[PDB]
Design a protein around this nucleic acid. Structure first.
Ligand code: CA
Length: 615
DNA sequence: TTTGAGGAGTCTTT
DNA sequence: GAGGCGTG
DNA sequence: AACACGCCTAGACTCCTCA
């Protein structure tokens, strides 16, 4: 059915969301109408529309429209879309600000020239503010401007906002089940599909699992609209931060903070609050909380720490939203109090509560403890005996470090140019480990996914699979993912722990063969260079090691997926292996990194920090 | 008025 | 978040 | 030497802007 990828991927999105009664409740007749209208277009019409949907939202010169793969002459196609009410022509081009925007710098010249009142030179931005002030006061001459501006611009089209808004809202619904497609893409700006989805959705093959919904996420179409608002807000803030527009970003955040304070009482929330965590993250309240968290990053960037500390205390005062984020919060609270506000009394309480919170883990739990030792073992603190108070003396077991060198040129070395980690590999190759992978945490991740695939994608857990295109159970990064599969996991873990170096070889082979290619977030099909490499490796690691790593990734992927060693190296014959974090001249171990190395050692694995010093 | 660097916008695959 | 790499 | 920030994140290609 020869459809081009962008259209195929678009169509997968509409289908996947429309086949949900739950989700279709969230659209009015008028809205659904527009969807049908899409389906009523020719393929040519639809191809163009997707293209235009994927461009930036604003007018386009007819000259800057070319898709010979769509049509050698597009006027009919445009006409179609225009009758359909999907696109608008220069004829509806009425705003002036807009017409000027569409005109180039040299075209703003020819208009600043054929209009004596204008100063004929300046930046594109300059001439615009000008042309707008003149049309504002003496209104009649501003119409003659618009006329020639329009004639100068040429024939132009724009996507209609109303139809666009609908597809965007479908996209939003699609992208939730898919984390968010990307943490900015089907968030906003004015939302389209992620590059990865746009290009690949139409070709992707997803794991089989049984859809099974017993729970509404959104009350009504209103509720979704709210959620979509906040989403586009959170996107906007994020875009500011990313460009350096920190002040703008602040206005946005406060604007958002008050918006959220209006909704505080709204009935929809009582229900949201009631949803399981793996679903609650798809509500207004959660998005706003995420905004607030960005707010505190902006407050810190503008060195306004008393205020960051207020927002941080405020977040940490409620357990309904983002409980996983508490680690980051407590940690960040403590760092602000200790290092930016020098208030040590509150810095101690901070830490104390932080460590009592079962929702703080790994990295941020270690960081808080490590600040706690720094304090009660410091001259400028000896005025207290209130951190000698029962500290679970969490002594992360010490690890074998090592130092190699390389000639400096992300850090480039020479040997042909290479990375830091690639230079460490070459060391270990000549240290008798012929085999090695620079895979960081995905090496272990795909192994876990290989060994537990069928339990990952097990049936019998309501709401964790809500539609066709998932690549993980929605509860995957949650405390509950283990809880809800306890008996199966427990048994699978036990079983791997005891499996000889050939049952594992065969388990992996079984999944690889049944699942190869299937999109699943844990697994990277090219992470190993062939099935037999994965086999070679699982053989070296053996049962208890493998079993332990999987145990953590399943108990707490949310807080464990990060910090595994850059490298796994092994001797083909001796079957001996080492887990190696490569640290360049300019870095030391993150907290997560050290917790892991401790943990790997407890499972009886050779672990090693390899430092590189330049020459 | 010429030249050049950096920006913005678009596209990718079945 | 994730994690490296560079400055203060 | 210990601790913090800051910045970034795909890649290629084209046409546009502004100095
Ligand atoms: Ca490293």
């Amino acid at each position: 059915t020869g459809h081009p990828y962008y259209l195929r991927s678009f169509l997968v999105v509409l289908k996947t969301v429309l086949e949900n009664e739950d989700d279709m409740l969230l659209f009015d007749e008028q809205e659904k109408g527009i969807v049908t209208k899409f389906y009523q277009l020719s393929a040519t019409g639809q191809k163009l529309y997707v293209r235009l949907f994927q461009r930036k939202l604003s007018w386009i010169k007819m000259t800057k429209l070319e898709y010979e793969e769509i049509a050698l002459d597009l006027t009919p196609v445009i006409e179609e879309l225009t009758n359909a009410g999907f696109l608008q022509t220069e004829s509806e081009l009425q705003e002036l600000s807009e017409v000027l925007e569409l005109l180039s710098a040299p075209e703003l010249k020819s208009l600043a020239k054929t209009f004596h009142l204008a100063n004929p030179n300046g930046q594109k931005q300059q001439l615009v503010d000008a042309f707008l002030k003149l049309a504002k006061q003496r209104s009649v001459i501003g119409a003659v401007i618009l006329k020639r501006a329009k004639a100068l611009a040429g024939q132009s089209v724009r996507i209609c906002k109303g139809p666009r808004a609908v597809f965007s809202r479908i996209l939003l619904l699609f992208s939730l089940t898919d984390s968010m497609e990307d943490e900015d893409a089907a968030c906003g700006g004015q939302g389209q599909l992620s590059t990865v989805l746009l290009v690949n959705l139409g070709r992707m093959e997803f794991p089989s699992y049984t859809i099974n919904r017993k729970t509404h996420i959104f009350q009504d179409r209103d509720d979704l609209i709210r959620y979509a608002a906040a989403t586009h807000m959170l996107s906007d803030i994020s875009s500011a931060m990313a460009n350096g527009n920190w002040e703008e970003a602040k206005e946005l955040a406060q604007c958002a903070k008050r918006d959220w304070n209006r909704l505080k009482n709204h009935p929809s929330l009582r229900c949201h609050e009631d949803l399981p965590l793996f679903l609650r993250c798809f509500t207004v309240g959660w998005i706003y909380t995420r905004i607030l968290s960005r707010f505190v990053e902006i407050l810190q960037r503008l060195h306004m720490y008393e205020e960051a500390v207020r927002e941080l205390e405020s977040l940490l005062s409620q357990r309904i939203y983002c409980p996983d984020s508490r680690g980051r919060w407590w940690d960040r609270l403590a760092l602000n109090l200790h290092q930016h506000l020098k208030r040590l009394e509150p810095t101690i309480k901070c830490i104390t509560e932080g460590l009592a919170d079962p929702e703080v883990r790994t990295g941020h739990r270690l960081s808080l403890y490590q600040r706690a030792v720094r304090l009660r073992e410091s001259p400028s603190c000896k005025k207290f005996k209130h951190l000698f108070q029962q500290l679970p003396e969490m002594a992360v077991q010490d690890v074998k470090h090592v130092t190699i060198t390389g000639r400096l040129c992300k850090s480039v070395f020479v040997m042909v140019l290479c990375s830091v980690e690639e230079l460490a590999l070459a060391h270990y190759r000549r240290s008798g480990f012929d085999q090695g992978i620079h895979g960081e945490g995905s090496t272990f991740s795909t192994l876990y996914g290989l060994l537990l695939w069928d339990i990952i994608f097990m049936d019998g857990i309501p709401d964790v699979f809500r539609n066709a295109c998932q690549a993980f159970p929605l509860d995957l990064c949650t405390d509950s993912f283990f809880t809800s599969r306890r008996p199966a996991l427990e048994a699978r873990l036990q079983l791997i722990h005891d499996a000889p170096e050939e049952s594992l070889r065969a388990w992996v082979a079984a999944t690889w063969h049944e699942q190869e290619g299937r999109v699943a977030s844990l697994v990277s099909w090219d992470r190993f260079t062939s099935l037999q490499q994965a086999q070679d490796l699982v053989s070296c690691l053996g049962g208890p090691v493998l079993s332990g790593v999987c145990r953590h990734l399943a108990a707490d992927f949310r807080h464990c997926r990060g910090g595994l060693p850059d490298l796994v190296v092994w001797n083909s014959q001796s079957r001996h292996f080492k887990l190696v974090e490569v640290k360049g001249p300019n870095d030391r171990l993150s907290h997560k990194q050290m917790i892991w190395l401790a943990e790997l050692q407890k499972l009886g694995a050779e672990v090693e920090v390899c430092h590189v010093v330049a020459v």
